[PDB]
Design a protein around this ligand. Structure first.
Ligand SMILES: Nc1ncnc2c1ncn2[C@@H]1O[C@H](COP(=O)(O)OP(=O)(O)OP(=O)(O)O)[C@@H](O)[C@H]1O
Ligand SMILES: Nc1ncnc2c1ncn2[C@@H]1O[C@H](COP(=O)(O)OP(=O)(O)OP(=O)(O)O)[C@@H](O)[C@H]1O
Ligand SMILES: Nc1ncnc2c1ncn2[C@@H]1O[C@H](COP(=O)(O)OP(=O)(O)OP(=O)(O)O)[C@@H](O)[C@H]1O
Ligand SMILES: Nc1ncnc2c1ncn2[C@@H]1O[C@H](COP(=O)(O)OP(=O)(O)OP(=O)(O)O)[C@@H](O)[C@H]1O
Ligand SMILES: Nc1ncnc2c1ncn2[C@@H]1O[C@H](COP(=O)(O)OP(=O)(O)OP(=O)(O)O)[C@@H](O)[C@H]1O
Ligand SMILES: Nc1ncnc2c1ncn2[C@@H]1O[C@H](COP(=O)(O)OP(=O)(O)OP(=O)(O)O)[C@@H](O)[C@H]1O
Ligand SMILES: Nc1ncnc2c1ncn2[C@@H]1O[C@H](COP(=O)(O)OP(=O)(O)OP(=O)(O)O)[C@@H](O)[C@H]1O
Ligand SMILES: O=P(O)(O)OC[C@H]1O[C@](O)(COP(=O)(O)O)[C@@H](O)[C@@H]1O
Ligand SMILES: O=P(O)(O)OC[C@H]1O[C@](O)(COP(=O)(O)O)[C@@H](O)[C@@H]1O
Ligand SMILES: O=P(O)(O)OC[C@H]1O[C@](O)(COP(=O)(O)O)[C@@H](O)[C@@H]1O
Ligand SMILES: [Mg+2]
Ligand SMILES: [Mg+2]
Lengths: 761, 223, 761
């Protein structure tokens, strides 16, 4: 099973997407965990060509304390030598000199295209190399096959076979840090903010930035503006002024073009807005800033996961299996053949060169087209000439969570677009009992994307105690559907209404839960809305805490995280920050395990690594509290390290939503509203709505590869109501990666890696 | 002791903490070793960048000049500490960074109650007996009170402030915030203030606690 | 080394002295710890004679939960069969049937006399037994030697070779519980309390009771009253009334006689007092109450120690060594040959039968005669026609300790008797600085014996700060000597004055330190005055706590004791209560030791024993606090036992002094005053006192065998001033007994047992 006797090469090439260091760290530590030799190839294909000093064997400490660093410690370089066979043969030679039959390439589309051509010529290169006399025929029959596992590291997201690439989330963090500087300000003058983003041949970052910030207009090469957009944009900004909206946001990709080949410059859009509107217009150009800063939590987790999966894919690969790209479609890890992904990238490039240009946007992926349609739908109120008798109320239940407001915004706009009469209720089920129902319009949710917490009130109270009042207000307002954006109490409340349908006919209404909570403890989804924001805030605090011990001092930090009995937040945060241990309820531990971990920490602390970090979930153990661990670590670490404690309380809660949470809540609010409309039409019979079947009450769910509506009655089996979490949580496999990256010898035979899948056309 | 060049300090501006090691140990214990190394390396001046221990150590060397001829060297203390507790200056180097980190945490903590919920946060700040960090942080964040050692407070003052907070939380402001300097009081700890505010605020507001530990320390320096 | 392959018999005979169960428990558990078989012989020599069912092999749990029980679970009986060879041969037979070549006898003088005659005839009995045909010649050459280790278990203390017997301390607890009922009330009428104590031939209990209670008169058989005592006693009680003392105490032994053989009855003394004084006179007769109640702490520790030492002496005994009695003279364990002790008992009995009757009291032991002289000296103020220019001041320094008042009372009376001008300073060195010096008289200390705490004030303040004020007040009041009764601060302060002699001429005064503290942390002594009281209070709390489960629920109690860094109080308390563990600073423990002990407790708790008890000294560990141990034991004991916690605070402090502490403080207060007078006369030269040598400032000891005087400068070497305790403490060998009684396999090669010693004439 173990990959002993074989050597893995890891290199980075192209623009240094942040999160590359996390991928390199996981590749290295997994490779030497499984017994394979890991060789770090510096400057990418440059150092592959020159070789020699640029190829160095890695140890466990070679990738220590880099997971929080942006860029790449390996370094990247553009080399033309790898384009030609003269340098590519030298690259194959240098790999043979170290016995590196296994290569991991972390880079963009050009990097992986070069890796594909390098595999395709590996036999021919070796043949010509032995023919020229630089390697004997023996020592060439071995190494006859080169194994390539590709990792897509780029902010562009230009590789068509792949949905999410390393550094996209963090490049979006950089963008939204800059846009939040504009939008969270108390708006004084009438002004226009034009943001230029670096995508010269892919407009994905421009798109997801526009969807996250609620941009008034978007220029992307995938969908150039129609003729006469000059007037249409200026008029849109004009009615934006008439609305009283003091700020306009224009997102313009560097690759912005018109229907012809002529590029649209950010300066042109500036001067255009200045001339026709007179708004104080300034262009913001991020430039190198997009690749800068720390990697986001998502980038660190996913880079670690894909780097581990890259190594494992590289060991289980026979001479026959093709070069693969380790990626995640949805939440599910997958391996895509390198050749098909490269072919799709060539097809989209050719299509974008005025071949199938109107039909190039679909080949970029259904996610891109869906994202752009959602953006335009939410951007401007088109006239809904259609109308329906249906009326729906939107609830926020439980604790506040980042992205509740994004979900409610999209649900409101989408419902108005379908002609539904949309209500909001404040204070959740308390207000639905108290009749705190208010009809809401398009602009009443204006600017709710970046607002954290809940613009509607939130209450944890369950409906069973005021079921009479709830049915009364449903009757009064004629509520035909109920959208509940909240945590475990949202699901449990909708469950109590479904169970109460038999007593009350009025409760036979279509219900939909959008899970929105810090803890990620709601059944029927892999990610709750706002868990990403909490994870990002948690690692940021942990990174700050870990940086406080200066380079001489040896210190361990016990950091206590929230999440109730759900350990998700603690464990992913431990992966993101390189925590030695993340104690959680789902992995019960006793004093024997604590002595093992403390001795493990002590031995590690005698080496060059000087800052330790153990995380503790708030409800992981009844007796071994944070104070207990502090006393234990400080006592046993006497003469080796000091111990400190930090209970991250509501530092993990109140932050504004991360760009993932904004887009994710946006998309789920749309998808919930689509499904609400479809179910209501499917259920409308005899002149009234009568939703009695279990399928009429679902959690929206992001599960594995796709969105999936799970009936609340069905989820009741897999729900630990006592601990307010699901019984079977997908993320327990990530504990194995967490423990592996901290040197714990854990037999991870239970980890399942994504299998080969052809590209979805 | 390592002789240094121009480029040995390259890129040290934005790096937080200390590239050179820091230790709190005062020079009096190893004074023979200090004078020996000053003699060996021919050290004619001494630039000490640090907190109260930096000033105190230079003071110990000045007082020991009478015993040791080698300690008659020019000395300069650059006050550099989170607490801003070094005499001779108004702003110790790095107090601004700590204040900025402290308010950022307090603004986040204050932002976490949302909508209707009436809640007070007891935030514990660092700074030793020096209350500077607590008080300026309370100004920056609009804290209702910043309990500090330099302004001794008893239970009468606490009841005044709690009743003040209670009446305020009945008004349209819903998120109170009081700061506690870590060494302001021997007995009225952050746990004490949590119990007090949560008891007297019963039926009006909830209370929560956050001890900003080394969240105020390791950040990169502010501009 | 181990006593494998050999069998030990343990029996109790005579009156059931409380503390016998502790001795039997230690004998049993040490016997099966060292690999020997232990046989419990029920009803003593009765069951030895009949044998059979009365001889049962013991396991570890056979003596479980008996250390706090008075009487004896083995049971005792008077048998005349053992007096005659007919039954004694049957006893030797029954021992041979079980292969019991080793016998431990726990009883009084008659018991040990019978054991001596049984050894002396063991060869003759075996010869006659094989001759009669009940044992073959083979199986009789083995067992040819019977090993006897005697333990003196009796309230009488009638065995002359031995200074202290098991149950003496607890019998005195009973006596003083009853006398304290009389003396501690607010006295209203003029009344006389005549206490009849159950010593029919030995007057030791009557004597130590009289000394502890400050009895007005004492009738003992060892010193019958002179002719015409009727008038002398009645006159003494008369002036007692004239003093205003509303209560008189008469202690009358059952064996009270006059100079002829005629016994003096308690009823006669009653009617005599009634007729001549008219005081409300009632006789209190304890009867069986003296053997009742729980054993005192001292009795439990010493019974455990002597039982262990009995077993060890029984294994290291060759055919040539004689029968021994394991006892303690002072604090030192010792073995005395059984024959010589029996011979001395016969000599004193013959002397008491009007042979050398006036000289029988000395053969009872020097402690008896000294106790009676101290009693009479302190009882009544005789006229001190001698006078001296010397003047001395008595301090109380540190925390209050039970028995300071007894010490000060004795020091005052003895100093006045020697013509000294006695001062008392309130609040210790604070008052000496402030000049709170008050000359004291005989009756100013009246009734100070039973009063706990400190009548004089105590302060912890050391004299160095106010040294100018101290020398000024010494000059003003002409203080030639200084008696400092207190804890570590008393020793440290006298040390500071001795070190400051070079600066101040006035500080060249004789100094004496009486160690008086709960912690027993004062260098130069084995027992600080009032440590016994604290131990007794602590075990009484632990016994109450351990009884709270009442055999149904199974629970562990973490009890926290005082004593600072000195672990003495915890460890002896753990011995007295059978605690599983007594965590102390002097025995540093880490989490590995804690897991060993918790698993040890868990395994034990699954057996028949249900009440666990671990003690923790307050300053044993920096991090593993009582809360830490509570969390640890409750977590690891989940599903086996519950955990509870009780911090004994000042429950161990304010109690009235135990009878040991009263007598102890009485005696060393006298001895300190004797030594003060001798040193002051040895140092008086040139018409003034000039005490500059180190020997003039000593701590009165009782360090191994008898009272000692350790100079404070010499003790400075063996003092841990940071932790306020001595560096080498005698009691660390008792940890091994503590751990052995709790089934901890500890190689106790470091324990030293008392060797053979001949009787001191
Ligand atoms: N068709 C190709 N054949 C061989 N090597 C190639 C090919 N394309 C690119 N490479 C090699 O990969 C290296 C990096 O590729 P590229 O310049 O396109 O950046 P990238 O990998 O796509 O990353 P990013 O888009 O984020 O900037 C190039 O220096 C080149 O040596
Ligand atoms: N927020 C926006 N950003 C960029 N382009 C936009 C935005 N809104 C509308 N457009 C573009 O303006 C053009 C016309 O807009 P409009 O939606 O009103 O008419 P349409 O024919 O119905 O287009 P659509 O297919 O989206 O329904 C379209 O090409 C559309 O892509
Ligand atoms: N983080 C925030 N906190 C509080 N208010 C905010 C935040 N972000 C935006 N706003 C407010 O939202 C208001 C509405 O304008 P905004 O720029 O946000 O979007 P909009 O153009 O009005 O409509 P849309 O939601 O479709 O984008 C602004 O006046 C601004 O004050
Ligand atoms: N916050 C930081 N943490 C760690 N290393 C840093 C930080 N900032 C800069 N550096 C490092 O400092 C190194 C030196 O280059 P840098 O850009 O910082 O300044 P420089 O041009 O070399 O000299 P100068 O100090 O005068 O500006 C860089 O390689 C960079 O890795
Ligand atoms: N001289 C002796 N020879 C043989 N056996 C004896 C002798 N004296 C006593 N015994 C035995 O020891 C047993 C107990 O002795 P005894 O009656 O004197 O009480 P004790 O041991 O002295 O205890 P206590 O004095 O406290 O009451 C007696 O029943 C008797 O069988
Ligand atoms: N508290 C007492 N209890 C019992 N007997 C006492 C007490 N005090 C005095 N006696 C006895 O009364 C007798 C005479 O007493 P007293 O001391 O006054 O004269 P004494 O000749 O000097 O005797 P002593 O040898 O003790 O000095 C003595 O036999 C003594 O034992
Ligand atoms: N535990 C106690 N607490 C408080 N006062 C006590 C205690 N014991 C005795 N006393 C007081 O001591 C007073 C003095 O009388 P006491 O019976 O005790 O001895 P005495 O005859 O006066 O002299 P001596 O000390 O020599 O025995 C009594 O009035 C009594 O109130
Ligand atoms: O797990 P939930 O119930 O869905 O909400 C998450 C939030 O609630 C908490 O339990 C804490 O809430 P409180 O501070 O009000 O007590 C944390 O887990 C987290 O801050
Ligand atoms: O006041 P100083 O001594 O100059 O340094 C400030 C830092 O030291 C502290 O006392 C805490 O240091 P420690 O965590 O190591 O105990 C805080 O006041 C602050 O983090
Ligand atoms: O050890 P010491 O100082 O001699 O006195 C013993 C007493 O003092 C103590 O330290 C406690 O005293 P305090 O309650 O006043 O703090 C205990 O060890 C004990 O009750
Ligand atoms: Mg690219
Ligand atoms: Mg007897």
């Amino acid at each position: 099973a173990s990959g002993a006797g074989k050597a893995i090469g890891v290199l980075t090439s192209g623009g240094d997407a942040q999160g590359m260091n996390a991928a390199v760290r996981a590749v290295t530590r997994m490779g030497i965990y499984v017994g394979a030799k890991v060789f770090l190839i510096y400057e990418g294909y440059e150092g592959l060509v020159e070789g020699g000093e640029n190829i160095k064997q890695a140890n466990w400490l070679s990738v220590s304390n880099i997971i929080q660093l942006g860029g790449t410690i390996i370094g990247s370089a553009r080399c033309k030598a790898f384009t030609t066979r003269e340098g590519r043969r030298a690259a194959a030679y240098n790999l043979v000199q170290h016995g590196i039959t296994n290569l991991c390439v972390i880079g963009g589309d050009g990097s992986l295209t070069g890796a594909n051509i390098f595999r395709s010529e590996w036999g021919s290169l070796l043949e010509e190399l032995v023919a020229e006399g630089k390697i004997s025929e023996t020592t060439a029959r071995t190494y006859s096959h080169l194994n390539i596992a590709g990792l897509v590291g780029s902010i562009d997201n230009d590789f068509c076979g792949t949905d999410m690439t390393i550094g996209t989330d963090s490049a979006l963090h950089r963008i939204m840090e800059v846009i939040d500087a504009i939008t969270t300000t108390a708006q004084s003058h009438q002004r226009t903010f034009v943001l230029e983003v670096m995508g010269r041949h892919c407009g994905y970052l421009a798109l997801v930035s526009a969807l996250a910030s609620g941009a008034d207009w978007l220029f992307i090469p995938e969908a150039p503006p129609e003729d006469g957009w000059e007037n249409f944009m200026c008029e849109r900004l004009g009615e934006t002024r008439s609305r009283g909206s003091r700020l306009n946001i224009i997102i313009i990709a560097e690759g912005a073009i018109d229907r012809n080949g002529k590029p649209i410059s950010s300066s042109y859009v500036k001067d255009l807005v200045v001339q026709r509107l007179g708004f104080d217009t300034r262009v913001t150009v991020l430039g190198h800033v997009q690749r800068g800063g720390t990697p986001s939590a998502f980038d660190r987790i996913l880079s670690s996961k894909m780097g581990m999966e890259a190594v494992m894919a590289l060991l289980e690969a026979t001479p026959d299996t093709p070069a693969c790209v380790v990626t995640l479609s949805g939440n599910q890890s997958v391996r895509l053949p390198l050749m098909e992904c490269v072919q799709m990238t060539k097809e989209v490039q050719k299509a974008m060169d005025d071949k199938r240009f109107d039909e190039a946007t679909q080949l970029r992926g259904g996610s891109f087209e869906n994202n752009w349609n959602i953006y335009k739908l939410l951007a401007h109120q088109k006239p809904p000439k259609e109308k329906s008798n249906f009326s729906l109320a939107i609830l926020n239940v439980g604790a506040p969570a980042a992205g509740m407001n994004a979900a409610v915004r999209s649900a409101v706009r989408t419902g108005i677009s379908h002609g539904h009469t949309v209500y909001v209720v404040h204070d959740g089920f308390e207000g639905l009992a108290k009749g705190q129902v208010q009809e809401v319009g398009w602009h009443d949710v204006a600017g709710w994307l970046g607002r954290g917490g809940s613009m509607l009130g939130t209450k944890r109270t369950l409906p069973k105690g005021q079921l009479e009042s709830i049915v009364e207000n449903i009757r009064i307002y004629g509520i035909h559907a109920l959208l509940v954006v909240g945590g475990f109490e949202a699901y449990e409340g909708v469950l109590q209404l479904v169970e109460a349908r038999g007593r009350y006919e009025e409760l036979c209404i279509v219900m939909c839960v959008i899970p929105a909570t810090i803890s990620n403890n709601v059944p029927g989804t892999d990610f709750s809305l706002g868990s990403d924001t909490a994870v990002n805030a948690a690692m940021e605090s942990c990174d700050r805490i870990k940086q406080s011990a200066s380079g001489t001092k040896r210190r361990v930090f016990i950091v206590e995280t929230m999440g109730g009995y759900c350990g998700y937040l603690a464990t992913v945060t431990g992966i993101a920050v390189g925590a030695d241990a993340a104690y959680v309820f789902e992995d019960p531990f006793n004093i024997h395990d604590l002595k093992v971990n403390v001795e493990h920490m002590t031995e590690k602390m005698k080496t060059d690594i000087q800052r330790g970090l153990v995380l503790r979930n708030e409800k992981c153990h009844d007796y071994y509290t944070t104070e207990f661990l502090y006393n234990l670590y400080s006592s046993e670490g006497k003469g080796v390290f000091d111990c400190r404690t930090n209970v991250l309380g509501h530092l993990q809660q109140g932050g504004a939503p991360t760009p993932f949470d904004r887009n994710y809540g946006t998309k789920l609010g749309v998808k919930a509203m689509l499904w609400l409309s479809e179910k209501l039409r499917e259920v409308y019979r005899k002149g009234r709505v009568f939703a009695n079947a279990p399928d009429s009450a679902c959690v929206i769910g992001l599960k594995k590869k796709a969105v999936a509506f799970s009936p609340v009655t069905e989820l009741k089996k897999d729900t630990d109501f006592e601990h307010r979490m699901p019984r079977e949580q997908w993320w327990l496999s990530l504990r194995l990666m967490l423990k592996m990256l901290a040197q714990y010898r854990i037999s991870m035979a239970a980890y399942v890696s994504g299998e080969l899948e052809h590209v979805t056309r």
